[PDB]
């Protein structure tokens, strides 16, 4: 198939700024590419279509160029309603092929996260299970680094995390990295500490206590 | 206006059928062909099939040929998307698009979770330590399908409140935590999963 390499994953932009999103088809796929806009839980909506081809009713600010195999989604004047997800579509064979996507959000200052870590719950022990939450609320930009330690020991493989959206306030983010062991586990290791690695903060904070 | 309205999605043991189908209303239907787009979750578009407007000529997505079967009934304006052996990787919300030669016309999509796990209610666990900013939560786990919601003090609080968003566990459960900040008072959290019927007021102390 035809695969549309698209970049950048994520972009950081302010209102009134000109942004510019990449899309390249590993082959030659003529002019036959759009690009979609989507914002969380809505469907996709066309912007462009035929490269540089305006869909009814979208803004000027949009507008596509490039033909062949580079192809350049640009947005004059940015307004706030415009940060969302975009894609790179091309219909020239099949299958139909998209671009990875690029979130586009709202550009801010550092901001720190506030860190807190959760012992887990006596009532949740009864049933033979720990989790142990570390918290970031609400630090900028998105990309943070937790480490879990356990008595000193480097944690892998037994945590998730989870990002909210951007805040449509304050434009931060938060982050919640959970480990996950069992009773037994649990109950041979004192200390759990949680280590934040972010450009907020002057050195990598670490948070933690005695079970 | 041009409308399209997906239905039949749920939640489908691996190996099982099901029948998507796309409500076009707004437009001549018989003069259009039709696509069918999913979305992963956490992932960008996948084409899936395309029908021409009298049906005639069909292309799948190599990842679902052989399996499923587009067709349409332009007498009532319905776009079908028949999915057999369905697997962990057809999870998706699947869309209804609609292409001329507006390029491409999208629904709001119908969500389809390939799962072999039983309808479970959350378990619902506090969140507290153990300065002036304070942080404490609920830690939602072990609940299935999506989704669960979460309040605050009834929806008396909602600054400061961050709901994660859920992730699937090995277990094929889903798990989230909510969490607020505070003034260093009552503090309840009130979970809701609608599959289940279950509703859960928890405090945290
Ligand atoms: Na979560």
């Known amino acids: 198939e035809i695969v549309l390499t698209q970049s950048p994953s994520s972009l950081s932009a302010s209102v009134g700024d000109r942004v510019t999103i990449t899309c390249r088809a590993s082959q030659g796929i003529g002019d036959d590419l759009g690009w979609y806009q989507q914002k969380p839980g809505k469907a996709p909506i066309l912007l462009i279509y035929g490269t540089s081809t305006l869909q009814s009713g979208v803004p000027s600010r949009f507008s596509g160029s490039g033909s062949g195999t580079d192809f350049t989604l640009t947005i004059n004047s940015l307004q706030p309603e415009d940060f969302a997800t975009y894609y790179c579509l091309q219909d020239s064979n099949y299958p139909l092929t998209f671009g990875g996507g690029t979130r586009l959000e709202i550009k801010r200052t550092v901001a720190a996260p506030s860190v807190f870590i959760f012992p887990p719950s006596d009532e949740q022990l009864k049933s033979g299970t720990a989790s142990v939450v570390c918290l970031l609320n609400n630090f900028y930009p998105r990309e943070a680094k937790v480490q879990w330690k356990v008595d000193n020991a480097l944690q892998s493989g037994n945590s998730q995390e989870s990002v909210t959206e951007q805040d449509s306030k304050d434009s931060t983010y938060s982050l919640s990295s959970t480990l996950t062991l069992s009773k037994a586990d649990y109950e041979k290791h004192k200390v759990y500490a949680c280590e934040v690695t972010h450009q907020g903060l002057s050195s990598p904070v670490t948070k933690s206590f005695n079970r | 206006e041009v409308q399209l309205v997906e239905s039949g999605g749920g939640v489908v043991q691996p190996g099982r059928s099901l029948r998507l189908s796309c409500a076009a209303s707004?437009?001549?239907?018989?003069?259009?062909?039709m696509h069918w787009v999913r979305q992963a979750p956490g992932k960008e578009l996948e084409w899936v099939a395309v029908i021409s407007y009298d049906g005639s000529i069909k292309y799948y997505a190599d990842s679902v040929k052989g399996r499923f079967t587009i067709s349409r009934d332009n007498s009532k304006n319905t776009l079908y998307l028949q999915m057999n052996s369905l697997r962990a990787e057809d999870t998706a919300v699947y869309y209804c698009?609609?292409?001329?030669?507006?390029?491409?016309?999208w629904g709001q999509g119908t969500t389809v979770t390939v799962s072999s796990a039983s309808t479970k209610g959350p378990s619902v666990f506090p969140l507290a330590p153990c300065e002036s900013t304070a942080a404490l939560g609920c830690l939602v786990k072990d609940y299935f399908p999506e989704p669960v919601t979460v309040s605050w003090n009834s929806g008396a609080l909602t600054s400061g409140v961050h709901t994660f968003p859920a992730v699937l566990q090995s277990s094929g459960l889903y798990s989230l935590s909510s969490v607020v900040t505070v003034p260093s008072k009552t503090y309840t959290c009130n979970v809701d999963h609608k599959p289940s019927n279950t509703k859960v007021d928890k405090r945290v102390h």
């Open positions: 707004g437009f001549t239907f018989s003069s259009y062909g």
């Open positions: 698009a609609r292409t001329g030669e507006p390029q491409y016309s």
